Structure 1
Amino acid sequence: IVTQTMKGLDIQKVAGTWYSLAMAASDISLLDAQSAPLRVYVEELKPTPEGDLEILLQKWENGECAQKKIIAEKTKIPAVFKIDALENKVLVLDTDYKKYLLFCMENSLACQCLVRTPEVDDEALEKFDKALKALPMHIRLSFNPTQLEEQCHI
């Protein structure tokens, strides 16, 4: 579905701290509750030497804000990674490395606007909303700076 990838992506430069400022999904039930399957809060990106992408995130599971480690394996396309499951692609749509990164995960579909700091970046949200115009989204969430500094954005 997603036909926006970052040309010339350098995966090593996305390493470090990120905040899930905004999230959108094709299906309300993917994001509606704290325990919703794609309500995931990114903490850190850890690209490996071989160019895989380790993801540290937080996810509400069985009443607690749990820490999870995901590995997204590189493909022939620098901006596309695969997670192992009962087959889920991560696409990097756009990043400036310093401030924002837009990504989508698709099997049904969820996208996030990541930012380096706990601040509302109007420029990153404009770019996120433009990228979503092309996509069939039915739920969109954004978080305030107080929530961004809390586990699972409470």
Structure 2
Amino acid sequence: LIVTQTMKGLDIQKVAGTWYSLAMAASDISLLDAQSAPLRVYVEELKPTPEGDLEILLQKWENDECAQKKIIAEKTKIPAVFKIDALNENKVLVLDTDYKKYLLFCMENSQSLVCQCLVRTPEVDDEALEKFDKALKALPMHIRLSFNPTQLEEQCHI
């Protein structure tokens, strides 16, 4: 567990709805470098199921097309930590959110890592980006990407 920042008292129900991946960062350049990189994902919506699991609707550029993807992150005993179903055990951690404006999360396996600043609106939230940068300084990131309001309103941020 490289990431040692989580949101205390996370109410997973209140993060439902629309988000924009305003920024992203990864421990490894190649995790995010090209449009088809395996962890370049854009979140459209989070749907917490009644059980306390979390469905994630996102867009990912695959075979020269912006593809929809639905994935479920299964709840654990820690309210801010969730398991995604890949080959290898993948954890999603919610580092921080104010529910109504911004949410910071990371995903790690077990050695490498990707994190995002999620925002509710197609706007550059300087304050949320500050928080994101501060959460990141204590992590070994090597690629950071940011998106403007025009790209935010486009499929796969083109």
Q: Do both proteins adopt the same fold according to a TM-score greater than 0.5, normalized to the shorter chain?
A: yes
Distance 2:58 2:85 in 1: 16
Distance 1:127 1:101 in 2: 10
Specify the SS of the correspondent of 2:35.
Answer: coil
What's the offset of the Cα at 1:4?
Answer: 0.3
Structure 2: unaligned runs, 5 residues or longer: none
Specify the SS of the correspondent of 2:130.
Answer: helix
Cα displacement string for residues 53-90 of structure 1 (whole angstroms, at most 9, x for unaligned residues): 00000000110000000100000000000001111000
Specify the SS of the correspondent of 1:2.
Answer: coil
Structure 1: unaligned runs, 5 residues or longer: none
Cα displacement string for residues 97-129 of structure 1 (whole angstroms, at most 9, x for unaligned residues): 000000000000000000000000000000000
What is the aligned residue count?
154
CA RMSD of aligned residues (A): 0.3
TM-score normalised per structure 1: 1.00
Distance 2:5 2:137 in 1: 12
Distance 1:98 1:24 in 2: 22
Paired residue for 2:67? Answer: 66
Cα displacement string for residues 29-60 of structure 1 (whole angstroms, at most 9, x for unaligned residues): 00000000110000000000000000000000
What's the offset of the Cα at 1:21?
Answer: 0.1
Distance 1:23 1:113 in 2: 6
Distance 2:117 2:11 in 1: 18
What's the offset of the Cα at 1:135?
Answer: 0.2
Distance 1:84 1:127 in 2: 29
Structure 2 residue 9 is matched with structure 1 residue 5: no
Specify the SS of the correspondent of 1:12.
Answer: helix
Distance 1:61 1:119 in 2: 26
- Identity of counterpart residues, as a percentage? 99
Distance 1:85 1:57 in 2: 16
